[PDB]
């Protein structure tokens, strides 16, 4: 379970996806 959605916007190159959280990004 890895897909959960914390904080879009939140990685360092985030650019509005949501793919999956490797370390809290949200790319």
């Known amino acids: ?3 959960s959605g ?3 916007x939140v990685x ?5 996806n949501x793919f999956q959280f490797v ?3 949200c790319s």
């Open 1 to 3: 379970k890895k897909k």
């Open 6 to 8: 914390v904080i879009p």
């Open 12 to 16: 360092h190159d985030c650019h509005m």
């Open 23 to 25: 370390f809290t990004c």
